[PDB]
Homo-oligomer: A and B are copies of this chain.
Amino acid sequence: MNWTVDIPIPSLPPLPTDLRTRLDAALAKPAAQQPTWPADQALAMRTVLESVPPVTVPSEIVRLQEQLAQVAKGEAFLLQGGDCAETFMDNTEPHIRGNVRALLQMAVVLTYGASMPVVKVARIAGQYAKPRSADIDALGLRSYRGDMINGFAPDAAAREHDPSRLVRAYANASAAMNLVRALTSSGLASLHLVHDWNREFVRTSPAGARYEALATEIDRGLRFMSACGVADRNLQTAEIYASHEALVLDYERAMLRLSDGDDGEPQLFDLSAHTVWIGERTRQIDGAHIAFAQVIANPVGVKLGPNMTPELAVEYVERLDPHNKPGRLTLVSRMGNHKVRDLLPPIVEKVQATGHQVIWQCDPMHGNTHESSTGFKTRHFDRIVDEVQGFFEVHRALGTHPGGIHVEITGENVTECLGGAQDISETDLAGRYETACDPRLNTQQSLELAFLVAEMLRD
């Protein structure tokens, strides 16, 4: 009941000596949150992934870098979203399409609200690993760490760390990515279609009166654009980039490719994605993740939680954006809504005074979690909205650019987060919980967030 892949038996060009040195130095540093599987099996899987067609190509990553530059300069806005954890079982056409649709829907609303371009980065085609605080979960089982490592099912065997999951992760990533590319160059990306869905959502949301005026104004803007002779064909094809947390270093090193351009010197690109981030757990300043990020040419992000200090933030900036390339680095604030107004300003002030131009991105989810009385991990919608609101106050008081958001969402009608216009309750949550990890905003709530964020952008 399985498929069989050969271990090739030459293949990669050898790295120039300095890249090999710097890559080895980076991987020899300590690395948190890594799977515990045998080195020889890891090595065999890396040798397979070293021969595969990449998920992305370097030109796409260079274009993304240029678009991110604009965001860092206060002339575009970044929307990053999708599943908390993608699963092999739900890597289907409807699930992919629903996430693509939700992202495009949010994006048009935010574009209108910001009056500037929106860069769309999905959490997709690789978001298959997660860190854990505890090795042992509530049931006394070894913790689930996403499908790149082990299985979600609640038995011990399924929780064993499996290295064959690295190659399965790629098979799933490459399939999803192929479809995302097909979808972004189809009618799914027509602005006028994508907007139409907003019209359904205003009708069928119980808070629709609340969003009606903005949705009609967007509709009018779109018609106005058409009225001036702009048809879909002339516009740029929609671009949705791929991202995940660079967690599993066995996966990410096997997906490195050596590439030309940008002054003609060889560079390493992680071709498992367009951009990756380093989470709070793995961001050790001398650890392998950060040192790995220094070696790759892709845009990167770092998650900054409530014990971050202005000084450590600056050191992240100096280490990861050493050439001062606007857009190369994104700092992702995840403070909690009760803390973002106090904790973010001095980080922002200090980083701004270095002269570097980073993207300030708000992740209003990770700081605002709690277990419910009914058993399911969950987040209140109002706290999410309030963190983003706080984030915008911080930048407005400083005259800096609130550059983006990073959310966990899905294009399905899941019940995972409390609240919204549907008023999802603790009792409601049990009925439809579909996440393999953290609770995502459903279709309706992610849309509603886009509308509220658009108002924060307009004011």
Contact = CB atoms under 8 A, between A and B. Distances in A.
A225 B221 contact: yes
B54 A93 contact: yes
Interface stretch (A114-122, A344-352, A381-389): A114-122
B8 A89 contact: yes
B7 A53 contact: no
A178 B55 contact: yes
Interface stretch (A167-175, A303-311, A368-376): A167-175
Contacts of A116: 223, 227
A5 B8 contact: no
A57 interface: yes
Interface in A48-97: 48, 51-57, 59-60, 88-89, 91-94, 96
A12 interface: yes
A183 interface: yes
Interface string A148-162: 000000000000001
Copies in the complex: 4
A226 B224 CA distance: 12
A165 B3 contact: yes
29 contacts: A1-B8, A1-B9, A3-B6, A3-B164, A3-B171, A4-B164, A6-B88, A7-B168, A8-B89, A12-B93, A52-B91, A53-B179, A54-B93, A57-B182, A111-B227, A111-B228, A112-B224, A112-B227, A115-B223, A115-B224, A117-B228, A171-B175, A175-B178, A178-B178, A181-B182, A220-B221, A221-B221, A229-B235, A230-B235
Interface of A: 1-10, 12, 44-45, 48, 51-57, 59-60, 88-89, 91-94, 96, 111-112, 114-118, 162, 164-165, 167-168, 171, 174-179, 181-183, 185-187, 191, 217-218, 220-230, 233-237, 257, 458
